[PDB]
Design a protein around this ligand. Sequence first.
Ligand code: ZN
Ligand code: ZN
Lengths: 102, 116, 79, 80, 94, 96, 39, 106
Amino acid sequence: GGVKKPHRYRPGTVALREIRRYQKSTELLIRKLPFQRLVREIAQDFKTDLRFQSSAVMALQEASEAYLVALFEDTNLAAIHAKRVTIMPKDIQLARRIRGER
Amino acid sequence: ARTKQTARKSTGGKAPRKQPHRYRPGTVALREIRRYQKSTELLIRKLPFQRLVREIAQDFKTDLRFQSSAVMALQEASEAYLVALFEDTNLAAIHAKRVTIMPKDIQLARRIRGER
Amino acid sequence: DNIQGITKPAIRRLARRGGVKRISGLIYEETRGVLKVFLENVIRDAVTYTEHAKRKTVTAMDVVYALKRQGRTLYGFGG
Amino acid sequence: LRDNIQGITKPAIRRLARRGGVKRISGLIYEETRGVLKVFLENVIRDAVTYTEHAKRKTVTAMDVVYALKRQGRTLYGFG
Amino acid sequence: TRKESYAIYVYKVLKQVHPDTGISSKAMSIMNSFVNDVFERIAGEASRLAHYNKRSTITSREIQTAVRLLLPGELAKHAVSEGTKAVTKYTSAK
Amino acid sequence: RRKTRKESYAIYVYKVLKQVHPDTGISSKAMSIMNSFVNDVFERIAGEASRLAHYNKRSTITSREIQTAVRLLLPGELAKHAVSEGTKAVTKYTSA
Amino acid sequence: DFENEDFCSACNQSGSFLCCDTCPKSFHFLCLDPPIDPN
Amino acid sequence: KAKTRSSRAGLQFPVGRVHRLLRKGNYAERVGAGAPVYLAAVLEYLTAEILELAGNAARDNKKTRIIPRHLQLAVRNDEELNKLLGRVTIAQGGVLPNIQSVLLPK
Ligand SMILES: [Zn+2]
Ligand SMILES: [Zn+2]
């Protein structure tokens, strides 16, 4: 007769819940070691064997997450601009086509 | 009973007192896209612009004369600012499957530009 | 009202130079306010600079100087 | 090393975008973003290896990073 | 080895404001870099103003034209007011 | 009361307009554009040189620290196509 | 609510009006049937 | 007995230091006596408004000591300090909590 059904939050509730979770966190998101490596291969191209402090990396990250959370933010406004809740690659592009990096 | 006064005159008679070929919409528009893009002259009639500056500078300091080259510098700068902002708006519009700049399209551009 | 002196066809001309093919009608009056607040930023700094030289007249040099501060340099008028 | 851009995992690119207040991240964004991280991190790190060499130092310093970010406009407080 | 920074000074003015509140060291460094940056911007603009007016000295006047050109909006008025009363007390106490 | 001397690179910009184009000419307005250009880019590169020096706790603008800043400002090819001409020019100077 | 007109709904002329409450039309004091005293 | 210039000016930030720095900064050839006094006066103000606002933020989160986050709130909540510190990215700040109205459930 009555068959079970698991308790699944509707698409979007878990979303907004972790939005409120993450907009109160100040902790960095991109993980450290993965990021650190991002550089050693993004630097090896500019100068060989450039050592890096454990603070340059942390800085070059804080500066990155900060740059990205800003761009995502203008991406969203750009996504809402077309009356849509999905962001698209064009958005990150319109946004950046207006900051003048493109 | 709500009442209102509109004559705004205590007495009447105040004056008598002691005290054919036609292009489709857009073709001419694109033609003078080309005209105002190949051109370099200054599109906001000058005098009107100069005045805009007198009545608006008045606030910061009275009796402020402006070297002629200055109000020409304000014009150039203003037309450059608005043509850049209008390129961005057209983009903020062509983004939303449309071809008509609308106020919202420019309240956004300026937000992404960060000029707000 | 000197602001309404920035006429529609003039805002249309700015849009044409800006590559816009259809201007809403409510844009014209948005472009005034945006225009004003911007001029009201340069000219403000133009004058701070002016009353620093104890000059009472403003110069185009002070105008491009205020633009340099704001960020948008203007070549062709000195400096 | 090589191709470590994939280290900025999707789970994370999201967490950042989630941080930025987005609710639906289309795919085809995870690739675009990593590209944006690699143009930013490029310029900054480049302007930092130039600062590094000028000082004839080898250890890219956090001090240089901050000065580099300044040049591009994105000043960072917290390190010097 | 000696590192010059605005540690004890900002701490003092913090107790002058709140004589009950602690401060984080990283947050301190935020304060130190922030006062250094705004100092650089106010002093640079001043240097410029001077070089435009063909002067050669950074008078208290320039720092003002500057503070009013950089600090935005009200933050300025209250900056000026406090700077003018500060230099007034400096000249009164000689 | 002859007007005082106004600094300008105009005379120079022409020598360089006369090599790249022995038969072209400029208009006052474009020349003044070019003078504002050279003053602006010179101020940019000279300001960068300054900090580079201050940062490294040293006090002298030299050729090294400017090859560095012109690189940090002029972007891309422009930079390389400059630093090369700049080192030549410096060596030809020091040559004699 | 809505602001009543500023022109009489009967004679299409300006003046002092008696404003309709549940209606956006305004009438002169003399333009109604029967005309309403202004006191 | 030598007194300091700050107590002459009535300030907490150092007026002496801000003179040296002004001098070695070579912002200009000659620097007067009152210029470091005014700058120390403005810097302490800006350091104060920001510290006050941070104090208003902290007590809210019931935390004794100010931590870098409290300094972002203070800066992004205020509309002035945000134009000033507007292209500045503070360490460990997070972002002002905000979600768009169209993203809310109906
Ligand atoms: Zn009715
Ligand atoms: Zn009537």
